[PDB]
Amino acid sequence: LMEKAARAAKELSRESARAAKELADSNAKAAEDLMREIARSSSSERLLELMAEAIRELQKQAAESIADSQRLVVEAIIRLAEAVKQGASEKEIDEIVEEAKKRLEELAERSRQENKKIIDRAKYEMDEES
Amino acid sequence: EKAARAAKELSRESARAAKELADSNAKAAEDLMREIARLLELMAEAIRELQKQAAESIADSQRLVVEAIIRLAEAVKQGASEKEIDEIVEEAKKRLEELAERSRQENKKIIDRAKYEMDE
Incomplete structure (x- = not known):
């Protein structure tokens, strides 16, 4: 069963990683959008400050997400090694x-939601200025 | 707007590096759990260390990316x-590739260390 547990561990880690990658892609596209809002508008340092703040918020939330799902994965790994011996x-x-x-996809869903809210707020606030 | 696509591509580059680190770590978890069949402490420590170094690398990458984005955004309009x-x-x-390389090496070292010591 330990072999099976190993496969399971690698799969959990890869699922976590994939969540992180999808989130990161969303954040990339967001960066593109914000910069287009920079270009299509008047010259304002303010918009740059807002874009930078947004990008930093997105990064922070991404780090928190990764931390959570990683904690989950390492705990599941330990739990598995424990179980294949108990x-x-x-x-x-x-x-x-x-x-x-289950918990990984739930965590990732909540994560995508927080991300989405951050992005929406950012885009809107950049709209309102200039 | 060229700079926009540039921003996206840089961000995606960073993310790809992160993904490679994570895949390496998955494989590492599998192997380390094969060497178990205590050793549990060694494995836990190794995995947590890999995660910590992953977060360090991602942080450095992120700072590079956002700095480049601000620089681009100023360059356009300037x-x-x-x-x-x-x-x-x-x-x-270039700088992203350098960082990604040294991070990749450190990760490889951590994994090899871990496996080698679960062998001892």
Whole structure:
């Protein structure tokens, strides 16, 4: 079962990573948009300050997301190594894995929501100035 | 607007580096959990260390990216035109590649250390 647990660990880590990558892509596109708002507008340092603030907020929230899902993954890994030595069933391992996998997608959903709110606020505030 | 696409590409470059680190770490978790079949403490420590170094690398990358974006955003509206913009972009790419390389090496070292000591 330890082999199976290993596969499970790699998969959880990769799911976390993929969440991080999708979030990062969204943030990239956001950066592009904000810069286009810079170009299509009057010359104002203010818009630059706002863009920088937005990008920094997005980075901070991204780091918090990664931290959360990483904590989850390492805990699931330890929990798996524990289980494959306390009483390795099969469906108990499958269950630990499926539960962690549940929490990962829930965490990632909440993350995408926070991100989205940040972006919307940013875009809007950049609209209102200039 | 060229600078906008540039911003996106730099950001995506950073993200790709991060993704490579994460994949390496997944593989590392698998191997380390194979060496278990205590050792649990070694594995936990190694994984947490890999995560910490990942976060350090991502932080450095992010600062590079945002600095480059602010520089671009000022360059446009200050003028300077295509060659100067391209130069800002390519220099940012260069420094990003350097950072990504040293980060990649440090990560590789951590993983190899970890495996080697779960062997001992």
